[PDB]
Each structure stands twice: as C-alpha cells, then as structure tokens.
C-alpha cells in the first residue's frame, strides 16, 4: 500500500511572555518518529519510535540544526504577518506549516506537498505540479511573488521528489515490524435500550493500524447516514486506533440493520448484524 | 550587483602589528564566513556569522577577531600579527534563511604576509630580454622575455605594454612567483613572462615594448631607517625598442 | 575527511573530456556545488546541483548519485583556459557549514600540430647581470624539470596564444648567473626531445 512521511510545525506567539512556542513533529504514516518542543529540556530533535534511535550523532545534530532554523523562520514570520495584516502587538497569533511526500506500493514518488497557515486558515500552498503557488489573499500575494522570484518551489521540488522519498524508504525498511504491519480491527457489538420504543445499536472497531477505517450503517443495502453517529478515530495510545459508529433504532428491527467495517487489515469487508 | 567585495588585495606586516580586513556584501545575505587558504591544507574556516549582531568561531579562530554590527559588513581583525598568519584570506557569503538558491559566493581575497623584520621587504628588479636572432631566423616569430627578480613579498602584478597600449593578445606569464631560495622563509621571489610577436612587428623600430610590474610593499606611514630606499608600493618597468636587424 | 576528492594533477588535452569526482560522507546532505579556482584568485562557482541525475550548463555537466554519495563534473570540449583547480562543496542545510574537498588541479594542454623544439639564448637589452635560456615550441608531452644545482632558476612550462596565426606554443625559461652557464646545458636534467634545435 501507499506510505507517507509528513512533518508538522507550529509556532504560537506569546505577547508579553517572550519568544514563540515552537513545536515540531515528524510522522511516517500514523507513527510519530521525531519531536522538537521549544519548551522541553533537551533543545534537540528527539526520537519517538524505536527504529529511529539507531541513527547516529550526525543525524541528530543536523535534524536539531534544521529544526532550530524552522523555529527561527517562523519567529520572524509571526512578526511579518502581524505587519502584513496590521494587527496589534497584544495578540497571540498562530503559524502552521506542513510538508512531506506520499509514495506508492512500489515505493516510487507519488505526491509531494507543502502548505502554510496563518491563524488556522490557508495562507500559501505549493500546487500539485510542485512549481506554482496558491496564495489565499492579497497579503499572501506578496509572499507568492517573493517566493516565485527567489525560486523556492524548485528547491522544495528537489526535496519532495528526492530526499523526502529517499528517507521515507530508509525509514520503511528500518522499521519493518513497526511500520509495515497491519492490524485488523477487533470487532465488538453493543445494544442498550434507551427508552421502551427506542434502542441504540453501536458498532465497535478496536486495536487497529493504520487509522483509516470505514464504518457505515445500513438497512437492506441502502446506507443510512440520516441516523448515524460516527465519532472521530482516536488513538488508543499503544500505537493502534479505535472508532465507533451508532444508530437510533426502533426496537424489533435490529436484524435488517447491518454495520460495515473496512480496513486494509481485512481480507473481506466485514458485516455485523446484532446477535 | 557588486557581490562580495573585500579590502585590501595585498598586505605586508611586521610581527605584532594590527590590521583589519574589510568585507562587504550587497545581497541582503545573513550568513557570512571568513576563511584562510594554504598550499598544504585547503580552505579552512576561521569565524562565521549566521545573522546581524551574532558571530561564532570556526575551526581556526585563534588570533583572529570578528564582529557584525550590520548585515552588510563582516570585518576580520588580527590584533597582533604572527608569521603563521601569512595566507590568502577569503570572505564569503550565503543567504542563510533569507533567500533563494543557497549558493555561497566568495570575495576576491586578501594576500597577507607577516615577517619578523620588515627590512626583508624588497622591490623587484625588472629586465627585458630581446628575442634571439636565431629564433627570427628559424620560426619568423619573436619572443621577448621579462624577468622580475629579487622581491619580497610575492605580491606583484605583471603586464606588457606595446606602443601605448596593454596587450593580452600574445603573452604568457608564470602563474606564481618562484622562490629564489628554498632555504629561507623570508626568501626572495622571482617571476617571468613571455611576449611573442611576428618578426616584422619586432623588426620595426617604431615599436616600443614595456614590461610593467606593480609591487605591493610598505606604506608611506611606515618608518624607514635604512640606507636603502624605503620599499613602498610602486611600479618598476623595463623596456626595449624594435630592432632593424 | 568529510569530503574526499580526486588526487591530481589531471592533464587533458584540448577538445577532450575532463571528468572529476568527489565523495562525501553524510547521507543527509542536500546541496552540492562545483567551484572553479584559477591560480592566484578566488573560487568562482560554476555548477549547483540539487537532485539525482544530470544538470547541464554549456560545456559543464554535473552528476549526482545520492545512493553512492558521489558528485561529479564532466567538462566536454576543453579550452586551455579551463586550466584551474576544481573544488567540490557539499552541505546539509542553510545553517550547515559548507564542506569543501581538497580540490583536483586540472591542466589543459594545447594541440601543437607540429613541434619545433628549440633552445634560444636571449640577450639582455639594458644591461642587467644575467642572460636567459628559452626552451620553446616543444611538445605538450614534454615536462620541464628544475633545479639539481642551487643557482640555476628554471620556471615551469606555460602556453601562449598568438591570436593571429592561431599559434599556441609552449615555452619554459631558465636563467642563472655566477657560473659557467650556457643554453646547451640548461635542460640537461630534463627529458628534452631528440631533435631539439640548438643554434651555436
């Protein structure tokens, strides 16, 4: 199957309280492998998966140095943006950046991406062609023209189609047992009568990796998202994931209702009507 | 559009004297570096600075001093000169976080010589040697050679001048000056060039040939107690005339 | 030794191909450069490469192999003015030090169509206190060797270009002073050709 490597960066300004909060995090698929926090003890990029600790001193020195530069640009960016939108110095604002690459099941380059947010909404992004930019408003138009003139896209392209996919492959083979595993969801099925005329059916899917899963509720083939309560996929905290789906059922009908689980751990997309 | 400039091109110092090397840059670059280059062991990094206000040491900081008040300028200070500070010094600049293509551009460099006694400084003698009659009568072409000899430090520039104007259009000068004495470290230097012309261009006595050697030596601020003339920065020439033979 | 480069010197005749290599030792490296440094001046940057494969600009081509950790530079169709030393530089990030190799010295030799090896005696036009022996019009195959004896000064060989005949010619100069010295015995410790013209 596909794999990805993504890096997430977050800078938050702290008016009156000094330098911004900087938090950086790296993922391969749904596995955090590295972290940096400006408030933590070490002042270094730090391991978060077993298979990345085997990297030597050079690796961590450069990662640390790079992420310190990412911190440094974002600290300056908060001051630029505040200037750009003429906002006061009293407020706390947020910068977010996300970059990385997808590879196919052959492990060749599939997609690269690099986006940027200011206060939680789109500021600037690389388009899929890895050559041009979408700037979200008139202030970001400035940044686009600046970055077009300074050939930023070409530099990014080299990373995204090159280094990004090279290092992903190294990670995917260094953590084979960790990252190339697939854990099928343990299913479970609960029913509690709410009130006399009404019952709730609830479909569980637990202990699964990776996080992408689909549960749908359905009568006679026709799927029912009119009654459906679907929670967000949530971390168990051991490396796997959890999700539930529910419906509001008129009781005495719970044989013609079916729950539909699919996940890449499943050879067959599972059905579970109530016992 | 002027890139990295630096100052001066050449310099002579007595042991213990101070100097500062100027270095400047045009392109709003944050990252600037200072290097030395030496025959046996490549480019070596002295001090560097990743933005305005801040600096850190390289692999050979000892005896050199640095600051960066403004993003434009990165001066290197040698407070008290040592005879091992003899080197070519290159200023350099990268965008750092500022910029585009992350290429580091170099400045044209400063060649510095530090000597224990500046009585060691000597200007060149310059001679021009006329083309052999035998060469004219074998190849019908005429080689004039210029010897510049007896100078210290190895800081010269040679150019040939014919009938008023400088020529590049038929010359070959040595890439570096020779040591005359592979014994001393205060040993004097010599350099040669060749100027080749056609036989009928040489034979015309209208034609004036002049070898020019710019020497870089002491300043006018420099104290000189010797009976010898103070070996300041100066140009010495030798000449010959066309010969109807 | 972070960046390992091609020993040298490397002699290639004109019109031919000079290939230069270097090897670096940090897998995380993301920037790759070739500098050209002529004798007595500053390194000038000629080629930057950022991704695997080939980049072509004019007579230059750089190749990158990040798997093998290998940067190279080919120079097709050599001019004698490509003679210089060529440094590879490698870096990891904007804040990483630029790692330089030692440099490969590349010497481009002229096609001298038909050699006319010859030693001439040049008279001083002033006076001075010496005379000059000029070995000229010899072979690009021929090396000149310097001092066995202390007082004899021989320069290294260089090429001139008379841009009218398109006449390239090699030349080398020997002079001396306080001895018994003539132009016959000035290149005795150099392997000079069989048919070198000595005028009497």
């Amino acid at each position: 199957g596909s794999h990805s490597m993504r890096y997430f960066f977050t800078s938050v300004s702290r008016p009156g309280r000094g330098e911004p909060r900087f938090i950086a995090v790296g993922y391969v698929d749904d596995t955090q492998f590295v972290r940096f926090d400006s408030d933590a003890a070490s002042q270094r990029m730090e391991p978060r998966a077993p298979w990345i600790e085997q990297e030597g001193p050079e690796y961590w020195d450069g990662e640390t140095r790079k992420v310190k530069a990412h911190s440094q640009t974002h600290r300056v960016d908060l001051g630029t943006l505040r200037g750009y939108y003429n906002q006061s110095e009293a407020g706390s604002h947020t910068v977010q950046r996300m970059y990385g690459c997808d590879v196919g099941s052959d492990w060749r380059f599939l997609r690269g991406y690099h986006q940027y947010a200011y206060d939680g909404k789109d500021y600037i992004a690389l388009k899929e062609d890895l050559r041009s930019w979408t700037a979200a408003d008139m202030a970001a138009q400035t940044t686009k023209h600046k970055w077009e003139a300074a050939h930023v896209a070409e530099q990014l392209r080299a990373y995204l189609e090159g280094t990004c996919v090279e290092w992903l492959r190294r990670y995917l083979e260094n953590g084979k047992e960790t990252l190339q595993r697939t854990d099928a969801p343990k299913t479970h099925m609960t029913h509690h009568a709410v009130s006399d005329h009404e019952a709730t059916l609830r479909c569980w899917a637990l202990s699964f990796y990776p996080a992408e899963i689909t549960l749908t509720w359905q009568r006679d083939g026709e799927d029912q998202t009119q009654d459906t309560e679907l929670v967000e996929t949530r971390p168990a905290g051991d490396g796997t994931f959890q999700k539930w789906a529910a419906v509001v059922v008129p009781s005495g009908q719970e044989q013609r209702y079916t729950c539909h689980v699919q996940h890449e751990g499943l050879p067959k997309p599972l059905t579970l009507r109530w016992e | 559009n002027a890139g990295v400039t630096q100052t001066p091109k050449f310099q002579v110092l007595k042991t213990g004297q101070s100097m500062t090397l100027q270095c400047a840059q045009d392109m709003n670059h944050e990252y600037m570096s200072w290097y030395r280059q030496d025959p046996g062991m490549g480019l070596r990094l002295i001090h560097y600075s990743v933005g305005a206000g801040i600096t850190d040491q390289g692999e050979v900081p000892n005896g050199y001093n640095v600051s960066r008040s403004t993003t434009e300028d990165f001066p290197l200070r040698l407070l008290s000169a040592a005879p091992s500070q003899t080197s070519v010094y290159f200023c350099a600049s990268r965008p750092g976080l500022a910029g585009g293509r992350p290429e580091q551009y170099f400045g044209p460099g400063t060649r510095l010589t530090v000597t224990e006694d500046l009585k060691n400084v000597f200007p060149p003698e310059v001679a021009v040697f006329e083309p052999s009659e035998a060469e004219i009568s074998h190849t019908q072409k005429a080689t004039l050679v210029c010897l510049a000899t007896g100078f210290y430090p190895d800081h010269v520039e040679l150019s040939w001048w014919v009938n008023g104007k400088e020529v590049h259009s038929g010359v070959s000068t040595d890439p570096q000056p020779l040591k005359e004495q592979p014994a001393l470290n205060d040993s004097r230097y010599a350099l040669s060039s060749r100027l080749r012309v056609s036989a009928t261009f040489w034979q015309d006595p209208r034609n004036h040939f002049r070898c020019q050697v710019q020497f870089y030596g002491l300043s006018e601020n420099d104290e000189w107690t010797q009976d010898r003339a103070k070996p300041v920065t100066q140009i010495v020439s030798a000449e010959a005339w066309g010969r109807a033979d | 030794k972070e960046v390992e480069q091609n020993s040298g010197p490397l002699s290639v005749p004109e019109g031919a191909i000079a290939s230069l290599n270097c090897t670096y030792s940090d897998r995380g490296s993301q920037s790759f450069f070739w500098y050209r440094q002529y004798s007595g001046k500053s390194p000038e940057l000629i080629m930057s490469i950022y991704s695997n494969g080939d980049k072509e600009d004019g007579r230059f081509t750089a190749q990158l192999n990040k798997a093998s950790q290998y940067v190279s530079l080919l120079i097709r169709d050599s001019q004698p003015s490509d003679s210089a030393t060529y440094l590879c530089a490698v870096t990891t990030d904007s804040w990483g030090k630029l790692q330089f190799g030692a440099g490969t010295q590349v010497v481009v030799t002229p096609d001298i169509q038909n050699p006319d090896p010859a030693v001439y005696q040049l008279r001083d036009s002033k006076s001075s206190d010496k005379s000059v022996c000029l070995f000229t019009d010899f072979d690009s195959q021929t090396n000149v060797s310097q001092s066995k004896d202390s007082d004899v000064y021989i320069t290294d060989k260089t090429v001139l270009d008379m841009r009218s005949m398109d006449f390239k010619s090699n030349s080398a100069v020997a002079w001396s002073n306080k001895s018994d010295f003539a132009c016959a015995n000035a290149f005795n410790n150099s392997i000079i050709p069989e048919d070198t013209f000595f005028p009497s």
Binding site: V76, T80, Y123, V152, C164 | - | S31, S94
Partner: peptide, 9 residues
C-alpha cells in the same frame, strides 16, 4: 529527514 532550506514568509 527534514527540509534543509526553509525561508521566510
């Protein structure tokens, strides 16, 4: 492996 050439907005 992170990106080595981050620039300003």
């Amino acid at each position: 492996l992170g990106y080595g050439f981050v620039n300003y907005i």
